[PDB]
């Protein structure tokens, strides 16, 4: 984990996989982003889209096109082109300790 | 966090909550069981059962009786009695690092 | 595979995993049910309910109880006991050849 | 199947059909690819695209134009012209025997 | 088709199957409901729910339970128990003739 | 309808519309083509490209030019000119009766 | 349009219908919300969900269950229960004048 | 907004931009054309084409040439010379009241 790496809190159900599926990062979890580790296809990541919303998706590649895919199928998959910048690789995820009291 | 504390890999959907509610411990996650800590009502814990098979659940109390309750509505509740014995309180949970490649 | 093993065509969506998750046996696939192989937990199988109902689920164990689980979340889980006899272990599955012209 | 046919393992969601539609080739399945058999419109194939990257899709024809179409609605469709080259016809598909342990 | 049969205009995406799966009854189509024909598992129907409101879905049976299942994945399946009653079997569908003006 | 009208089973997803759009003619349905009725813009029809294979689209006029339009946005629009010959207007569509058990 | 009625700017693509569908409200358009007009199934409303955040969607109901549905089939259809509160009916939508030079 | 200006109902996808890009005038919208105003390059206008057939497009200037550019990349570009005359400027667009209920 580089010095640059920072923590973020999963906010949304976009990355919450269907029951029985894995991995899954339910809204509430923490994810460690590390701007210094490249993001390869199949890796999870944070990416800044148009305007300023960062997103947490699985970066995939199909037919030469790169998409940011959600673990929740009920959500949209999106092309990652011009206004799509990968900020860093998600290298870890754990529930915050409060979660256990 | 005690020294008798150990890691276990969640294997099942019993602790997988309906999308939206939290927390949620999906099959494949890592939980840290600490025997040297008590399981107060509402805490998450491991419990050795008859044939000595662990069970991941939430300890709840209802009239001098103690129950092991799954976060997955589909999974039935279970009364903790003769062969039932808490093995420790779950204090942490994270995805194995292999998860992030 | 015993000389008693037999093929069956999956008919239904009880074993159809959510896009992204495996395995999955969509309606249309074939499955080899071997009556002579024991069904350990975590194994896919063909069980009979009542006496004439053929069911295709994943046999599991939660909190000391055995359940026939569907790979399709929307479908209810079911406890396997008295009127629930395992018919055989699913040991292979493939699409029927016609599937390809 | 020709002696030049090999097995590939599906990696992705592009060929995963929505519940109800068939066939479907979810990530993790094995597909037999025969480079000696030709791919007629409607067949399932592997094709080499731009940077020579392989892609598993359905070859279709519409309005006298050829397309590589995914079984999964979320994925885009691609015109199979110049930099599109067919590697082989998909002729079999099954889960690896590990699937049933 | 009995003398009691009547047509209903499909209102809603409940029975719209995803692209590539058939059949599909998109919002706008016509369905001939016949109250005098029994609805076997597999058939499409109109059932009246506890609310006392009408619903259009596919009736299925799994592990002994009966459900009214939609063709659109985004919609929930529902057990057809007490407050669930079959109004009639859906036996034909077509676009109104205005569709082609 | 004229005596020149015949039935055609829609084959392909060119005329399948996005969920929540109408009309829509999913692969599987039956469209009634009547060669004797003029195909006005906004009408559905069967056309011939290169004087051979049929294309089932929606004739339209934009900026003085004519195009055969697919109800599926993924499919490209195609200019109807020289090698483009309209075979007849689509006047009715329905699911074959087998569809309903 | 009551006094309470206020204007919001559509932000996002949850209500951008697929090319060739209607209505549709691309990110950028304005929408008049009137808290004083009820919202019947089929209406376009503004709801406030859990996180104290607002959503613009079409209220619908299926099998006696209310859902907030998006015009974009990509996005998810969410059940509107406990934490879901309908704030107002959307009764108008127009682009801002700046739009047109 | 002049006395000569009038409302028109957009009919077509010619002016339906790709999701994300704005503006976008989906088939079904109302656009207000003001004959009295001039259509500077970049503005949206109406145009009489030959035998009196309207066209909704954007007025661009490429190579000292005045074309009619569509917002839908799928639709061909058209030059506005002889048999092409502007009919006014699009100064406002909005959805018909009937759209909301």
Curated annotation (Swiss-Prot), chains A, B, C, D, E, F, G, H:
It comes from the Viruses. GO terms for biological process: latency-replication decision; maintenance of viral latency; negative regulation of transcription by competitive promoter binding; positive regulation of viral transcription. Keywords: DNA-binding, Latency-replication decision, Repressor, Transcription, Transcription regulation, Viral latency, Viral latency initiation and maintenance. Disulfide bonds: none annotated. GO terms for molecular function: core promoter sequence-specific DNA binding; identical protein binding. Acts as a transcriptional repressor that allows virus to establish and maintain latency. Prevents both the viral DNA replication and the exit programs. Clamps the two operator OL (operator left made of OL1, OL2 and OL3 sites) and OR (operator right made of OR1, OR2 and OR3 sites) together by binding to them and arranging the intervening DNA in a loop. This step allows repression of lytic pR and pL promoters by binding to OL1, OL2, OR1 and OR2 simultaneously. Bacterial cells harboring a lysogenic lambda phage are immune to further infection by lambda. The cI repressor protein inhibits the lytic development of any additional infecting phage particles. The region of the genome that codes for the cI repressor protein is known as the immunity region. Homooctamer. The DNA loop is maintained by octamers of repressor cI. This is Repressor protein cI. It comes from Escherichia phage lambda. The lineage of its organism: Viruses, Duplodnaviria, Heunggongvirae, Uroviricota, Caudoviricetes. The gene is cI.
């Amino acid at each position: 984990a580089s010095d640059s790496a920072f923590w973020l809190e999963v906010e949304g159900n976009s990355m919450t996989a269907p029951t029985g599926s894995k991995p899954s990062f339910p809204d509430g979890m923490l994810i460690l982003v590390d701007p210094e580790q490249a993001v390869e296809p199949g890796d999870f990541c944070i990416a800044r889209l148009g305007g300023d919303e960062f997103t947490f998706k699985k970066l995939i590649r199909d037919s030469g096109q790169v998409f940011l895919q959600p673990l929740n199928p009920q959500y949209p998959m999106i092309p990652c082109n011009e206004s799509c910048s990968v900020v860093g690789k998600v290298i870890a995820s754990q529930w915050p300790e409060e979660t256990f009291g």
